[PDB]
């Protein structure tokens, strides 16, 4: 699996669960178009988002649909969502874990790049 | 000043220098329109975006262009920019302070809203 | 002001208003000695723990009082408080901002040091 | 297993490898006293800190080494080490991640307590 997006919750200290995430490519004119979607598991994991021949080097966008998350939960959120943007490159063999913190008025991203 | 941006780095554990940073805020077609622009001084925070006035409710996407930072420096990092996005002065006017903490291959961004 | 503690609250988006500070500095017998404490203010600031003269070469241990701050407020807190050891002015006096941002269950802690 | 340990590291956007964890549980004098310890893996990972049997309710502290990993890359850190101290509770049956994500100048640890 070429790219991974792992979602925890601050406040509760666990997994976000049903969160949705969408995956958008930036196409040659500068529009973000839909390349990916789904919703984290139990574990907070979204695996099967894409295979290693439709992830092509290129600007990606991970949104994470935190809004709903929080609200769901009764906490107030800040953020529409938690946007990461970031550019596939091939130069050598690459796994994507794009993991996401949220609390209602902040959230870390980090990306963790194997071989 | 209404929306204030504040960035650090937490390589060299100093303010982030001449960050660039763009605001855009959506239209009634759903696009994003330019809003405001600006970079961040020494001291790693960007006064002065917008006004009270000009600052209206609204869905705010707050752009801080981390690469062009970082390769300036002499690091690879992995994000375009940092993203924030979120509706404004829902319920009156609010002041907002986005903060980011950034590294080549992670950052935090975390708002302080307080009433005027 | 050599020794400046920021402290902000992730879950309201506001400073982190009467949290506990207290700084230890590791002694010659290896103890962790009492050097200083306060609270931040309304600001989640913390100034004037300590002075330029009083602030020496040494590793120091900032613990925020986390926990506490946490169950004030109704929260159920993981940590009982965040710690963040280092060693200081081990190249001349510096000035050292603590800054940390609190959830419940995560904590985030980052040194903006500046020479003055 | 009770306690679980993962580091990442925010510079090279990777797991933080040879990393030393020292585990101390806090003696009824307030002494931290020796509890558990390793090295984290190639994933960052480190498991068999401890057992059911063994980890009991308590004040524990989870120091990690950092000093030592931003040396040998040459980065200069600024913490002495990252210092996660928390409550084991036993309400209900648990599992912890304690992760830390570091920078030389910064880290953030999130606490993942599942059941």
């Given at each position: 699996?070429?790219?991974?997006?792992?979602?925890?919750?601050?406040?509760?200290?666990?997994?976000?669960?049903?969160?949705?995430?969408?995956?958008?490519?930036?196409?040659?004119?500068?529009?973000?178009?839909?390349?990916?979607?789904?919703?984290?598991?139990?574990?907070?994991?979204?695996?099967?988002?894409?295979?290693?021949?439709?992830?092509?080097?290129?600007?990606?966008?991970?949104?994470?649909?935190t809004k709903s998350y929080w609200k769901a939960l009764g906490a107030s959120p800040f953020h529409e969502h938690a946007e990461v943007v970031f550019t596939a490159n091939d130069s050598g063999p690459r796994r994507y874990?794009?993991?996401?913190?949220?609390?209602?008025?902040?959230?870390?991203?980090?990306?963790?790049?194997?071989?």
């Amino acid at each position: 699996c070429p790219l991974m997006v792992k979602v925890l919750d601050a406040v509760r200290g666990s997994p976000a669960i049903n969160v949705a995430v969408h995956v958008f490519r930036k196409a040659a004119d500068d529009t973000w178009e839909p390349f990916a979607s789904g919703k984290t598991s139990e574990s907070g994991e979204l695996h099967g988002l894409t295979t290693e021949e439709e992830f092509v080097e290129g600007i990606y966008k991970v949104e994470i649909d935190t809004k709903s998350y929080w609200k769901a939960l009764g906490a107030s959120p800040f953020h529409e969502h938690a946007e990461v943007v970031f550019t596939a490159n091939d130069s050598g063999p690459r796994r994507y874990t794009i993991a996401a913190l949220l609390s209602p008025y902040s959230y870390s991203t980090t990306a963790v790049v194997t071989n």
